[PDB]
Symmetry: C3
Subunit: 308 residues, 3 copies
């Protein structure tokens, strides 16, 4: 089974530019080379070419609706192609508005996949609940079958069709949820392990419960959307929306090591790394190196060691 | 059920002045406003006016015995009044020598309450065991029925009458206990979860065991005395007596979230925040903001999110 | 039962000099004085005098083979002498190539001892697997009976005879293991709790499982080789080979407090403290003070407190 890296240098999902430099920063740190040192065969698709859309006026509150919807439509078609060729897809973010396209194309080939969303935010605001118009905080809303038609059709996402139900997703790391988002998850009954559950159960018991909840009935493809700001700002400083009291370096590597070991990883996202957002160059290097550490962990690198 | 904030800008319980600025710093950070954003109705009593006592010579080793005893006598009368009016009292410290008065007035109305003392210190030195004469480290000794008459009567605290027994208190966070204090807790058999027990059990299992130990026989009012230095100096830098290897931001918020959820919080203390003690202005802001985070957590703010 | 401190100011086990200053730094911090404040009677043997060996050419890849082998031969004879006099030996490192001599002399008197190796590295490379020729990363290989004759005889260590089997050692803290080392531990089946197992089980459950695994059949002398770099570089900065995502201050003190409580500690090593390796003087003081904290914890100092 081979790995396919896909660059998604996108920033229209939010206001801060620079996140579109995440793919390259990740590559600068030597992500591809280190990945070839693993058991997987690695192919690099390069970065997608996103067509800026000139007259992209806000749909009500939603900003850059057409740019975001057009960029995700491309990503889906690409991801669906590599999943269609039996390869694990690895999308390097820009912002997480690209998760819409990553999960969508992936779910076209493996419509039975589950989603593990490591993040400090649920990103489940709908065009009507979002306090800001940033689409990097509404991905999940465009994908959930239950939310289908709960908000007006947004220009650019007509190609979208909810692919997952509230039962196929599990959140890990939550510590910054909005009233609407919180109402949504409690009503739809989405499974989540916010920081308070990681503090109560411990990350080991969390992964165990995540797996039996998602893979208990049948083993199926896993799709991990890791948002760099899921870990504490002491580890991943260079992120647009940092929240204190998050996951530790260890707990992060633990989640990816457990997902690796399940042998079910099918799709992977490394989002929200903004190479221009730390306080110092070291904060950036720190954020990037840990992002690479997590991607490598998802593909075999164990802390106990490794040998051929 | 309403909340009543009570400012206790006191510093005679120790040598460093500045802690009496804790109430205002807390208010500066917007504590009252953020509290009104919760389900509770909030009232602010303001800061008590403490009468300095001119000829306050040390009673043996005990310093400022009359100032401390007079200030706590006032606080009790106030707290007893608001508890008497069915309102949860929130005392903002100065130093924790004010816990004597907070718990005392509270126990007048709800004589059945239990005490959860989050701190790196037991603060159970008696006027005869204390190596220094600082009364912020002897509060518990003036309140424990078992210690009644175990030390000479200290000027200013005649109005005091032990209100709680060794069985009604639980410590969390200990990592700096004196020989006398340690002898006291092991003989009286006071329940405690020092740092080594948090490391062994995990904070989730700690709160569980704290609750079944205190509320196992009958649900009763809870009195939480949170000493800002219960958390590691990486989180609450601006404190008079910092000790390394303490509670994390997460474990602290976890304790308050669990106490909130019990629905039994009746009295709350936020002590030892000294706005003039960090190394930088950020260390102060850090200490204060986390203090506010804990007070808000005690009143409903969950990390998983909230909605009306 | 008395304590015997033994200075092992050695640096030939690696390239960076300065680690030979570890004993003195440790003494500067007041290790001996603080140790006399405990229940144990303390004696200080001083620092061993290591004879530099002029024509110490590399045995194949192994560097300073004769210096290292001669220095460890002396240490064994010393340790065997104090163990022979019924005293717990405390060796202050230089580098951990001295563990060979510490464990060897110790095993001469208590051939039934088990070994708890707290470290980020397994240090089990053999002269043939080691990528560098540094002997501070091959100690375990010279001691394991199973590895006897698995590599050519190294000049200077003829006096050595494997004293422990794969079943008598337990690792704690691993997060940087080499392919050879990993093959060795998985084939010989050595018991280990790498960082991923500490994250999954928690340090409390780790010590429990360490003790029942080593002391389950019969209580026997324990030999703890603590490598300062077993704790995260945020705690022990001044170390030659720091690895991110390690043990916390608390987890470290927890391991030593549990080993103390077993009452079986017979040999202790405090290795890899290099007084000339931090980024600032505070990083050094931090490393040293925590090293002393761990040694004191191994001898009775509890975080819950202590009294006579
Ligand atoms: N609560 C925010 C969502 S921020 C989402 C950031 B990220 O995509 O990185 O998780 C809102 O209303 O847009
Ligand atoms: N062990 C100290 C007690 S320090 C108490 C500080 B605080 O009140 O903040 O816990 C003594 O002998 O006064
Ligand atoms: N993996 C390294 C071992 S570094 C050992 C350092 B220390 O002794 O401090 O654990 C090598 O091939 O020498
Ligand atoms: Cl390849
Ligand atoms: Cl429609
Ligand atoms: Cl109100
Ligand atoms: Cl009397
Ligand atoms: Cl002595
Ligand atoms: Cl031979
Ligand atoms: Mn996100
Ligand atoms: Mn996020
Ligand atoms: Mn206190
Ligand atoms: Mn304290
Ligand atoms: Mn070592
Ligand atoms: Mn090491």
């Amino acid at each position: 089974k081979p790995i396919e890296i896909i660059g998604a240098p996108f920033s229209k999902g939010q206001p801060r530019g620079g996140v579109e430099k995440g793919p390259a920063a990740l590559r600068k740190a030597g992500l591809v080379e280190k990945l070839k040192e693993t058991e997987y065969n690695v192919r690099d698709h390069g970065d997608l070419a996103f067509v800026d859309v000139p007259n992209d006026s806000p749909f009500q509150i939603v900003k850059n609706p057409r740019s975001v919807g057009k960029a995700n439509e491309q990503l889906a078609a690409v991801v669906a192609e590599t999943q269609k060729n039996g390869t694990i897809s690895v999308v390097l973010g820009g912002d997480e508005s690209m998760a819409i396209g990553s999960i969508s194309g992936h779910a076209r080939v493996h419509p039975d996949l589950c989603v593990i969303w490591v993040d400090a935010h649920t990103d489940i605001n709908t065009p009507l609940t979002t306090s800001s118009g940033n689409l990097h905080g509404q991905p999940v809303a465009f994908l959930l079958k239950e939310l289908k038609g709960k908000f007006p059709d947004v220009p650019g996402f007509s190609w979208v069709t909810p692919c997952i139900s509230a039962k196929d997703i599990v959140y890990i790391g939550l510590r910054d949820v909005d009233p609407g988002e919180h109402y949504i998850i409690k009503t739809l009954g989405i499974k989540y392990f916010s920081m308070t559950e990681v503090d109560k159960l411990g990350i080991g018991k969390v992964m165990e419960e995540t797996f039996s909840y998602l893979l208990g009935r049948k083993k199926r493809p896993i799709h991990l959307s890791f948002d760099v700001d899921g870990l504490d700002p002491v580890f991943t400083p260079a992120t647009g929306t940092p929240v204190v009291g998050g996951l530790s370096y260890r707990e992060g590597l633990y989640i990816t090591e457990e997902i690796y070991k399940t042998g079910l990883l099918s799709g992977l996202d490394i989002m929200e790394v903004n190479p221009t957002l730390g306080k110092t160059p070291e904060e950036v290097t720190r954020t990037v190196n840990t992002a690479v550490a997590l991607t490598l962990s998802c593909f075999g690198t164990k802390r106990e060691g490794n040998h051929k």
